[PDB]
Amino acid sequence: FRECSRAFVKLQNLENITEDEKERYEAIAVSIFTKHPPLDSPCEYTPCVGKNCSQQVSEYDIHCRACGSNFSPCVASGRPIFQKEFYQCKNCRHKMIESEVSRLKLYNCALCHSPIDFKRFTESNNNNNNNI
Amino acid sequence: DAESQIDFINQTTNNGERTSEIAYLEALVSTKQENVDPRVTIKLLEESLKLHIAQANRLYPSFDFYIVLNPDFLMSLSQAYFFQVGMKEMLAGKQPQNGVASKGTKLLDFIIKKIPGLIPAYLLQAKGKMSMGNTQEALKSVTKVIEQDPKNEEAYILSAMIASSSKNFSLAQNQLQQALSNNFMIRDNPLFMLVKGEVEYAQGSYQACLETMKAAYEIPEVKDKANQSKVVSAMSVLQFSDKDRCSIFLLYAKALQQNNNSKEAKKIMTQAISQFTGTTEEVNVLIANSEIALQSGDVKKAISILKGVPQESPYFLRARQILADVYLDQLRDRRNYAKCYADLIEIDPSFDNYKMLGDALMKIREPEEASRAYEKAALIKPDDEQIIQLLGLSLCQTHDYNKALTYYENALRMNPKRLDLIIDLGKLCIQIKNFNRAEEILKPDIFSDEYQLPTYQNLKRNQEGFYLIAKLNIKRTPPGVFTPIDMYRKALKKSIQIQIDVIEKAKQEGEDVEKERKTLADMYIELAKYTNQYEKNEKATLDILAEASKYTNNQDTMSKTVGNQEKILEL
Ligand SMILES: [Zn+2]
Ligand SMILES: [Zn+2]
């Protein structure tokens, strides 16, 4: 409900809105947040990989506050890259997680649909990382 | 030397009578130093004026008493008063908080009342009136000057400034055309060409502005330093100072920038930076350097300049604000936008840093962090009722009604004499759909505060309380009832009567009210709809809608506001 509250506060006035639309918006907001108070759902605070700070960051969060190290997206499923296993093709260069591709059995890139074997891209990215 | 002689006189006159002229000399000396607080000059000028007026008032006004009154001396006093107001603060209509311009204008008013034939007094009066934002009174003073002296060039030029500041470019153009044919030598006067360039730039005539300011660049600017350090010349209300020269330089660079002459703008501006270094003009031209470097697409140098301002510079806050404004719009990221105020915090905490952090977070709509900053501020500042109301609003806007309600109840428990707190609690309680407690809180407090009637803001709070009471009354109406709730009607008439009273109160105070006029017209519309919904009293509804229509037909609401008349005519 923290993200819901932030989104609802954003939606109350974007640039312009009629009175009735805004009215039904706060009516919905009041109903939702008066039925029961906003409760933060617990999750796993995985260790951060962007920097050396020991302050763990929430799994959903990609902002990475006070560090400035934003995380690259995963086009396969949307999960932020929190592991060594990340590869990309030479058409869209988007970081792919091996586990997500294995689970989904994706023969092509999720964004640009590059029709070349993904295991060879994984090996090539491993070689490139070894070069770095 | 003058300061030393004044000190010698004061030491030798340890029991001598304090005179107006000694105080005026001390005020001028204090004006001429950079490190003296302006309040000292203000009190010296006030003492001199008080002594002079005390000398004059023992007496009846013949020739000897226009001698003793010395209208020239009072005019010089008014000029010394106006010297404390900067030309940019002068044009913007923002009076300084110390009110020196009002005092000077009042002195000029007394001079004019005693001597209505003093044209320079009228010129200075129009000047000060334009300083306090009274453009119409400045215009009427200029019209007096023109009718007294049709040849008065400075009158037409001043009419040009006032028309340009009021966005009446055609009238300013006519005044400038009159001034052109008035005299040919004042086409060498720096102030006149600065005016002409400013007006031409405001009208979009960039080529004419460029030519005028080139001719305004071959006059004595490089000689203006020695002229200002050694001012010996027949001067008047219009005095060419170093600030006007800096304005000429900056607007010349600006006009070069708009004409795609970036190299010449940059060279002129590099000249300007090294020409005003040492006074406040150095940081001013540094800010201009950030601005025009931004306009040239070179954002890195501008950011470095705005960041290189140290923490001991009074313009550090303004530099950070302008750095953040250009960072959120051009780069389009809220992260460093909030960071540009966060850093202002951790660099050095103060009694207001958390406040504008909360203001920035409201502007970006991040209620939780702003609430945290505001509670830190409330920890820093003991009572600070403004931080109390800001915390209340933030906790009401964070969609966590329980803690906001608890905070409101606590704050009422400590101090039950905060009307705004009661109104905010009522709004939150009607938001949470708790009508009984809301009305039980609204009715006693609203029915108890009828002792401070002459106050304007308290009347506004009473009107808001009555309006919220009426809203609560109309909210608790089950659908399908067609009975006229008379007590809501009585509250509504009370609310509109108080609104009329407070609109008049805004009138004698010279404050914009058209927002109050339009909200009262809206409330008339709501009352007409309410009285139409239940009883078909067509005559009363028509009369009320007619008075609402004629009531919203004041000032310039013809073209600006159109929805109000649209709903009126729909009804
Ligand atoms: Zn991190
Ligand atoms: Zn791809």
mmCIF file of N, CA and C in Angstrom, chain A residues 48-97:
data_model
loop_
_atom_site.group_PDB
_atom_site.id
_atom_site.type_symbol
_atom_site.label_atom_id
_atom_site.label_comp_id
_atom_site.label_asym_id
_atom_site.label_seq_id
_atom_site.Cartn_x
_atom_site.Cartn_y
_atom_site.Cartn_z
ATOM 1 N N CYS A 48 22.696 -5.495 -1.441
ATOM 2 C CA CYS A 48 22.896 -4.667 -2.620
ATOM 3 C C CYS A 48 24.158 -5.087 -3.363
ATOM 4 N N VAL A 49 24.082 -5.064 -4.694
ATOM 5 C CA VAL A 49 25.227 -5.404 -5.530
ATOM 6 C C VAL A 49 25.773 -4.201 -6.292
ATOM 7 N N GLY A 50 25.055 -3.075 -6.307
ATOM 8 C CA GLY A 50 25.534 -1.913 -7.036
ATOM 9 C C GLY A 50 26.792 -1.319 -6.432
ATOM 10 N N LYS A 51 26.833 -1.214 -5.105
ATOM 11 C CA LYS A 51 27.956 -0.607 -4.405
ATOM 12 C C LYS A 51 28.345 -1.486 -3.224
ATOM 13 N N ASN A 52 29.345 -1.026 -2.468
ATOM 14 C CA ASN A 52 29.864 -1.783 -1.336
ATOM 15 C C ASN A 52 29.096 -1.531 -0.046
ATOM 16 N N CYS A 53 28.074 -0.678 -0.071
ATOM 17 C CA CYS A 53 27.331 -0.364 1.143
ATOM 18 C C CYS A 53 26.618 -1.600 1.678
ATOM 19 N N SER A 54 26.629 -1.749 3.004
ATOM 20 C CA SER A 54 25.958 -2.871 3.648
ATOM 21 C C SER A 54 24.461 -2.645 3.813
ATOM 22 N N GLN A 55 23.970 -1.440 3.535
ATOM 23 C CA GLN A 55 22.546 -1.144 3.648
ATOM 24 C C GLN A 55 21.792 -1.851 2.529
ATOM 25 N N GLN A 56 21.014 -2.869 2.885
ATOM 26 C CA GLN A 56 20.268 -3.625 1.891
ATOM 27 C C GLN A 56 19.135 -2.785 1.309
ATOM 28 N N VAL A 57 18.801 -3.071 0.055
ATOM 29 C CA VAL A 57 17.756 -2.359 -0.671
ATOM 30 C C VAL A 57 16.624 -3.334 -0.964
ATOM 31 N N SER A 58 15.396 -2.822 -0.930
ATOM 32 C CA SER A 58 14.227 -3.651 -1.181
ATOM 33 C C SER A 58 14.261 -4.214 -2.597
ATOM 34 N N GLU A 59 13.662 -5.398 -2.757
ATOM 35 C CA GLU A 59 13.703 -6.090 -4.043
ATOM 36 C C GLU A 59 13.006 -5.285 -5.132
ATOM 37 N N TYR A 60 11.849 -4.697 -4.816
ATOM 38 C CA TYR A 60 11.112 -3.936 -5.819
ATOM 39 C C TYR A 60 11.828 -2.638 -6.172
ATOM 40 N N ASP A 61 12.489 -2.018 -5.196
ATOM 41 C CA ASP A 61 13.095 -0.712 -5.414
ATOM 42 C C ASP A 61 14.240 -0.801 -6.416
ATOM 43 N N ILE A 62 14.279 0.165 -7.333
ATOM 44 C CA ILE A 62 15.340 0.262 -8.329
ATOM 45 C C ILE A 62 15.997 1.629 -8.211
ATOM 46 N N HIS A 63 15.442 2.480 -7.343
ATOM 47 C CA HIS A 63 15.961 3.835 -7.190
ATOM 48 C C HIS A 63 17.384 3.828 -6.642
ATOM 49 N N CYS A 64 17.651 2.977 -5.648
ATOM 50 C CA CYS A 64 18.960 2.878 -4.998
ATOM 51 C C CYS A 64 19.382 4.239 -4.431
ATOM 52 N N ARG A 65 18.585 4.694 -3.466
ATOM 53 C CA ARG A 65 18.772 6.012 -2.879
ATOM 54 C C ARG A 65 20.101 6.095 -2.132
ATOM 55 N N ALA A 66 20.664 7.307 -2.112
ATOM 56 C CA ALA A 66 21.889 7.636 -1.387
ATOM 57 C C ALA A 66 23.109 6.919 -1.956
ATOM 58 N N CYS A 67 22.934 6.201 -3.068
ATOM 59 C CA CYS A 67 24.069 5.533 -3.695
ATOM 60 C C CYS A 67 24.247 5.986 -5.140
ATOM 61 N N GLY A 68 23.143 6.239 -5.840
ATOM 62 C CA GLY A 68 23.206 6.702 -7.210
ATOM 63 C C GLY A 68 23.448 5.629 -8.245
ATOM 64 N N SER A 69 23.439 4.355 -7.855
ATOM 65 C CA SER A 69 23.717 3.247 -8.768
ATOM 66 C C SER A 69 22.396 2.574 -9.126
ATOM 67 N N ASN A 70 21.741 3.088 -10.163
ATOM 68 C CA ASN A 70 20.516 2.473 -10.652
ATOM 69 C C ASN A 70 20.817 1.128 -11.305
ATOM 70 N N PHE A 71 19.829 0.238 -11.271
ATOM 71 C CA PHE A 71 19.982 -1.128 -11.749
ATOM 72 C C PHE A 71 19.379 -1.274 -13.139
ATOM 73 N N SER A 72 20.078 -2.007 -14.003
ATOM 74 C CA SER A 72 19.606 -2.219 -15.359
ATOM 75 C C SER A 72 18.380 -3.133 -15.365
ATOM 76 N N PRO A 73 17.448 -2.909 -16.285
ATOM 77 C CA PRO A 73 16.249 -3.748 -16.350
ATOM 78 C C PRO A 73 16.539 -5.115 -16.956
ATOM 79 N N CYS A 74 15.610 -6.037 -16.713
ATOM 80 C CA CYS A 74 15.588 -7.338 -17.373
ATOM 81 C C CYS A 74 14.316 -7.405 -18.211
ATOM 82 N N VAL A 75 14.480 -7.399 -19.530
ATOM 83 C CA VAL A 75 13.363 -7.356 -20.467
ATOM 84 C C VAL A 75 12.571 -8.657 -20.388
ATOM 85 N N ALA A 76 13.219 -9.725 -19.917
ATOM 86 C CA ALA A 76 12.569 -11.030 -19.849
ATOM 87 C C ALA A 76 11.365 -11.019 -18.911
ATOM 88 N N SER A 77 11.541 -10.522 -17.684
ATOM 89 C CA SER A 77 10.465 -10.526 -16.701
ATOM 90 C C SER A 77 10.304 -9.222 -15.931
ATOM 91 N N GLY A 78 11.280 -8.316 -15.971
ATOM 92 C CA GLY A 78 11.197 -7.059 -15.258
ATOM 93 C C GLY A 78 11.963 -7.010 -13.952
ATOM 94 N N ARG A 79 12.440 -8.149 -13.457
ATOM 95 C CA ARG A 79 13.206 -8.164 -12.222
ATOM 96 C C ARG A 79 14.545 -7.452 -12.413
ATOM 97 N N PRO A 80 14.948 -6.618 -11.457
ATOM 98 C CA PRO A 80 16.255 -5.959 -11.559
ATOM 99 C C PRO A 80 17.395 -6.966 -11.500
ATOM 100 N N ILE A 81 18.502 -6.598 -12.141
ATOM 101 C CA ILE A 81 19.676 -7.465 -12.243
ATOM 102 C C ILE A 81 20.370 -7.458 -10.884
ATOM 103 N N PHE A 82 20.205 -8.540 -10.123
ATOM 104 C CA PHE A 82 20.824 -8.688 -8.811
ATOM 105 C C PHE A 82 21.796 -9.864 -8.765
ATOM 106 N N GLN A 83 22.343 -10.259 -9.913
ATOM 107 C CA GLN A 83 23.208 -11.428 -9.969
ATOM 108 C C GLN A 83 24.233 -11.262 -11.080
ATOM 109 N N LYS A 84 25.280 -12.090 -11.010
ATOM 110 C CA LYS A 84 26.314 -12.092 -12.039
ATOM 111 C C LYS A 84 25.749 -12.504 -13.394
ATOM 112 N N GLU A 85 24.739 -13.372 -13.404
ATOM 113 C CA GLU A 85 24.188 -13.873 -14.656
ATOM 114 C C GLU A 85 23.374 -12.801 -15.372
ATOM 115 N N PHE A 86 24.019 -12.059 -16.269
ATOM 116 C CA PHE A 86 23.317 -11.104 -17.122
ATOM 117 C C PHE A 86 24.026 -11.062 -18.465
ATOM 118 N N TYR A 87 23.260 -11.139 -19.552
ATOM 119 C CA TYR A 87 23.810 -11.106 -20.899
ATOM 120 C C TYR A 87 22.889 -10.296 -21.804
ATOM 121 N N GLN A 88 23.416 -9.915 -22.964
ATOM 122 C CA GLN A 88 22.681 -9.090 -23.911
ATOM 123 C C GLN A 88 23.117 -9.460 -25.320
ATOM 124 N N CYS A 89 22.257 -9.141 -26.282
ATOM 125 C CA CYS A 89 22.543 -9.381 -27.688
ATOM 126 C C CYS A 89 23.122 -8.113 -28.312
ATOM 127 N N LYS A 90 23.526 -8.198 -29.579
ATOM 128 C CA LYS A 90 24.153 -7.065 -30.249
ATOM 129 C C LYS A 90 23.159 -6.333 -31.142
ATOM 130 N N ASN A 91 21.889 -6.316 -30.741
ATOM 131 C CA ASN A 91 20.870 -5.581 -31.481
ATOM 132 C C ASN A 91 20.140 -4.611 -30.561
ATOM 133 N N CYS A 92 19.959 -4.998 -29.298
ATOM 134 C CA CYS A 92 19.304 -4.133 -28.320
ATOM 135 C C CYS A 92 20.062 -3.985 -27.010
ATOM 136 N N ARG A 93 21.058 -4.828 -26.729
ATOM 137 C CA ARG A 93 21.940 -4.720 -25.560
ATOM 138 C C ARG A 93 21.158 -4.505 -24.259
ATOM 139 N N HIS A 94 20.242 -5.430 -23.987
ATOM 140 C CA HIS A 94 19.469 -5.443 -22.751
ATOM 141 C C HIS A 94 19.858 -6.657 -21.918
ATOM 142 N N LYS A 95 20.052 -6.442 -20.618
ATOM 143 C CA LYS A 95 20.564 -7.491 -19.745
ATOM 144 C C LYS A 95 19.516 -8.573 -19.514
ATOM 145 N N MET A 96 19.898 -9.822 -19.783
ATOM 146 C CA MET A 96 19.006 -10.967 -19.667
ATOM 147 C C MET A 96 19.465 -11.854 -18.518
ATOM 148 N N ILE A 97 18.515 -12.311 -17.706
ATOM 149 C CA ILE A 97 18.804 -13.242 -16.621
ATOM 150 C C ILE A 97 18.650 -14.665 -17.139
#
